[PDB]
Structure 1
Amino acid sequence: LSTAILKQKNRPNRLIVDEAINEDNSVVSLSQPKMDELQLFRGDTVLLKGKKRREAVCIVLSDDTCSDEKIRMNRVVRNNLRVRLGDVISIQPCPDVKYGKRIHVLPIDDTVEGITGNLFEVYLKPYFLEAYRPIRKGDIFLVRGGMRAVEFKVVETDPSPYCIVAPDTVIHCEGEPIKREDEEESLNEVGYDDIGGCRKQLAQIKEMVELPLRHPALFKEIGVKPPRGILLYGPPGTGKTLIARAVANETGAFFFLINGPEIMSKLAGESESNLRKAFEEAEKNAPAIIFIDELDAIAPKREKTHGEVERRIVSQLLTLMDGLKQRAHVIVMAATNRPNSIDPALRRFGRFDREVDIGIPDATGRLEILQIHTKNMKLADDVDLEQVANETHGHVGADLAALCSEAALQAIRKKMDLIDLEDETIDAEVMNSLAVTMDDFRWALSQSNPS
C-alpha cells in the first residue's frame, strides 16, 4: 500500500529461472510461444539482467519442454547472474554486439593444482573453436578438458564489456591464477535480499534515493523538489552500514562512500580536501549517491565540540550540503546510532531533513534475518528458526549474526575431541558430518546478551 515501490511487476520479459535441459554455458532455453512475443529469432545473442546489477550474455534457443514465462539456464549462468533457481530476470535483445579483438582470462587457483601442460590448448582452444560465443567481462565459466574441469574468469575484453569470440580473437591466458577466496567474497557481496525486517524502511530508501534519480520527471511533472539529505538512525547494529552496502551494489547511480572515523584519521586540512574531493567526484559523475557512515564522528555539535580543526569540518560539510545546485542530481545519505549528538544545523530544512529510523526488529523480522544468515550454513533438520525467532527478544541483526556464529562454534566444539589442534589436515569424513544441531542453537541462546 505504501510498500508499493517494492512489489515488482508482471512484464513481457520477466521470466522465472528454471533448470537447464541443454547443458551449455552460452545457452538459454525459452518457450516458442514466448520467443515470438518478444520478437526473438533462434541463435540471437541476448542480454540478461540479474541481481546486484549483474549481467550475462547468451545465445537463445527454443525449448519445447519450457513454460512460456519460464527460462532455462545452467548453474554457470545462474552464477554470473547471481540468482538461485526460482528467481526472476530481465531478457533483452542485444543486437549490436561486436566481434572480439582480444580477451584476457585467468583460471581459479584451486582448480589448477596439478598439471599445467597447456591451458589454452587443452581447455580454451576447443571450448571456443568455431563456437562464436558471447562473453562479458567478469564472467566465471567452467571448461571440462578430458580428466579435469577448470573455472576461468574473464579479466578483460576488447571491446569492453562484451564481445563475440570469433576465430580472429586473440586469447591471452598468461598471469597469476585468480584466488578463490576473492571470488567467494565477490559472490557474497550484499544485495537488498540480504537485509531482513526492514521492508518498511527499504521502501522509504528506494522512495527517496532510487526513485528521484531513476525517474526525476515524476517530480518535475507534479512540480515538487525531491529531498537531498537522508539520515538513517537506529540503536547500534541494526544494519545501517549493512544497507550502505546493499545500496552501493544495488544502485543505478555513481556511489561514493565516506567513513567518518576514516575522515577523522587524516591530518588537519587533509580531511577537508577529501570532503570536497568526494562532493566534487559526485557532481562530476552525477546522478550520484554520497554515503556518510558514522556521521556523528564528523558532525558533533559545534557548540559542544572541543578541537578547532574539528569545528572546521562541520562548517566545511554544511557549506557543501548547501552548495549543491538543483540541477546537480545528488542525494546525500548518512547514518548514525547517536542522532541526538549531531549538530542540529545539519538537520535543518534542505540539509538532512528526512529521517529513516532503523529500529529493533519484531518477531517476524528476527525470523527473516535468521533465514538470511543461515542460507549458507550447514543446519540439521531438527532446527526450528521460528523457535529461535520467538526466543530472541530484543536482539537486533548483529545480535542474531553473533548467535549463529556462536552455535556454529558449539557445533565445531562437539568435534573437538575427535580432532587435535595440532594435526596438519582434518579427517575428511568428520568435515562432512559437521552441522549445526538445534541443541547447538539452544546453547548459543543460553549465552546471549543485550544489544
Structure 2
Amino acid sequence: YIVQAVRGTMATMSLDDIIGMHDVKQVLHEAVTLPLLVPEFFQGLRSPWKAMVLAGPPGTGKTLIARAIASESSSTFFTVSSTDLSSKWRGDSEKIVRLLFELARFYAPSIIFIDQIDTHEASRRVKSEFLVQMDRRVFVLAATNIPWELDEALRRRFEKRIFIPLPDIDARKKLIEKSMEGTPKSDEINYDDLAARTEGFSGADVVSLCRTAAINVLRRYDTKSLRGGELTAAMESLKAELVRNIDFEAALQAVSPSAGPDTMLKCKEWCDSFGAM
C-alpha cells in the first residue's frame, strides 16, 4: 500500500572500536551472535535475550553503537525513529507495525535499532499494537535519555534494562590515545595530567576536545587572515604540523562539559530499584 516508508528504514566499519561496557558487549556477543553460530543451543530456557534497553546521558555511546553493530552483523537490519507518523489521509499507522514485525520475521534473522522511545490517542494505539507483535531468531533494541517515563509496562518487555556511566577516567585515557590515532601530535603529551581535568565529560566532549586542539593549532597561525585565498605551502603542510599539551590546555580552560549531573544521578538511582539488569 504505502510501505515505501519502511523501505527507507533499511540498510545492509568495525565492532570493537568501543571502550567500555564489557558486560553489554558480552551479552550482545551472547544473545545475538552465538545463536546465529550455534542455533542448536539457544531454545526456550536457553533462548536468546529477546530485547533490552540502553539508558544513559547524551553522548554516552547509545546512538553510537548501532552503526558498528549492523556494520558488523551479517543479518538484515532496520533503523527506526518516532516517525512512523500518522495522517488523516492514512487514518492509521499501526498496520505499519504489523508489516514491520511480519516483515522482520519474513527476513527472519533481523534486528532493530530505535531511538527517542518516549514517543493522547495514537500513542496508546501504536503502544498497543507494538505488543502482540513484540510477543526464527530476532532481537530488538531501545534507547533513551529520560526513561523515567517508560510510559507503563515495557519495564518487563525489554528483559534487561541497563544504565551506562558518564565514563571513568582510565577509559578516557583509552578514548583519547585511541582518538588521536593517525593524527600528528608531539609525543611529549602525558594523558594522566590531561585525564585528571576530564572530570564530568563524556565521549562527545572528549572527541570534541581532540577536534578543539586540531583546530587550535590552526588558531595559533594566520587563521583569520588569508593566503590570498590560496593554500600556502605551509597550509598544505599542516598535515605535517603537530599538536601539543598547550593546544588542549586552551580548550580545557575554554570548555565545560556542557551538561549537568543530576539527570545521571537520578536515572542512576532508578537503574537499581525499578531498573532491571
What SS does the aligned partner of 1:336 have? coil
Structure 1 partner of 2:24: 201
Instruction: Name the aligned partner's letter for residue 38 of structure 2.
Output: H
1:287-307 residue CA offsets vs partner (Å, 9 max, x unmatched): 1111212222x2xxxxxxxx3
1:341 to 146, 149, 173: 149
Question: Gaps spanning 5+ residues in structure 1: where?
Answer: 1-189, 299-306, 323-327
What SS does the aligned partner of 1:416 have? coil
**Structure 1 401/271 Cα, relative in aligned 2: closer, same or farther at 3 Å?**
farther
Q: TM-score, normalised by structure 2?
A: 0.77
1:414 to 181, 205, 220: 220
Deviation for aligned residue 1:422 = 7.4
Instruction: Name the aligned partner's letter for residue 319 of structure 1.
Output: V
Instruction: Name the aligned partner's letter for residue 340 of structure 1.
Output: W
Which protein shows a greater Rg? Answer: 1
**Structure 1 390/208 Cα, relative in aligned 2: closer, same or farther at 3 Å?**
farther
2:87 to 267, 290, 293: 267
Deviation for aligned residue 1:380 = 2.3
The alignment status of 1:309 with 2:114, answered yes or no, reads no
Structure 1 partner of 2:163: 357
Separation (CA, whole Å) in 1 of partners of 2:112 and 2:206:
29
Separation (CA, whole Å) in 1 of partners of 2:215 and 2:175:
19
1:394-405 superposed matches below 5 A: 394-405=200-211
Q: TM-score, normalised by structure 1?
A: 0.49
What SS does the aligned partner of 2:193 have? helix
Question: Gaps spanning 5+ residues in structure 2: where?
Answer: 1-12, 260-277
1:201-350 superposed matches below 5 A: 201-220=24-43, 223-260=45-82, 262-264=83-85, 267=87, 271-296=93-118, 298=119, 307-322=120-135, 328-348=136-156
Separation (CA, whole Å) in 1 of partners of 2:204 and 2:176:
11
1:184-199 superposed matches below 5 A: 190-199=13-22
Instruction: Name the aligned partner's letter for residue 333 of structure 1.
Output: L
**Structure 1 210/294 Cα, relative in aligned 2: closer, same or farther at 3 Å?**
farther
Separation (CA, whole Å) in 1 of partners of 2:183 and 2:96:
40
Separation (CA, whole Å) in 1 of partners of 2:253 and 2:20:
24
1:443 to 245, 250, 254: 250
The alignment status of 1:431 with 2:254, answered yes or no, reads no
The answer to whether the 8 A contact 1:197-1:362 is kept is: no
* Structure of higher RCO (CA pairs closer than 8 Å, 6+ residues apart): 2
Determine which structure has the larger strand proportion and give its number.
Answer: 1
Deviation for aligned residue 1:227 = 2.2
Separation (CA, whole Å) in 1 of partners of 2:137 and 2:251:
47
What SS does the aligned partner of 2:167 have? coil
Deviation for aligned residue 1:399 = 1.4
> How many residues are matched?
242
What SS does the aligned partner of 1:232 have? strand
The answer to whether the 8 A contact 2:51-2:158 is kept is: yes
Separation (CA, whole Å) in 2 of partners of 1:445 and 1:314:
44
Deviation for aligned residue 1:271 = 4.5
The answer to whether the 8 A contact 2:155-2:161 is kept is: no
CA-based RMSD of the aligned residues comes to: 2.4
What SS does the aligned partner of 2:140 have? strand
Give the percent of matched residue pairs that are identical in Structure 1 and Structure 2: 37
1:287-338 residue CA offsets vs partner (Å, 9 max, x unmatched): 1111212222x2xxxxxxxx3222212112123212xxxxx31111111122
Deviation for aligned residue 1:440 = 0.8
Instruction: Name the aligned partner's letter for residue 415 of structure 1.
Output: Y
**Structure 1 383/317 Cα, relative in aligned 2: closer, same or farther at 3 Å?**
same
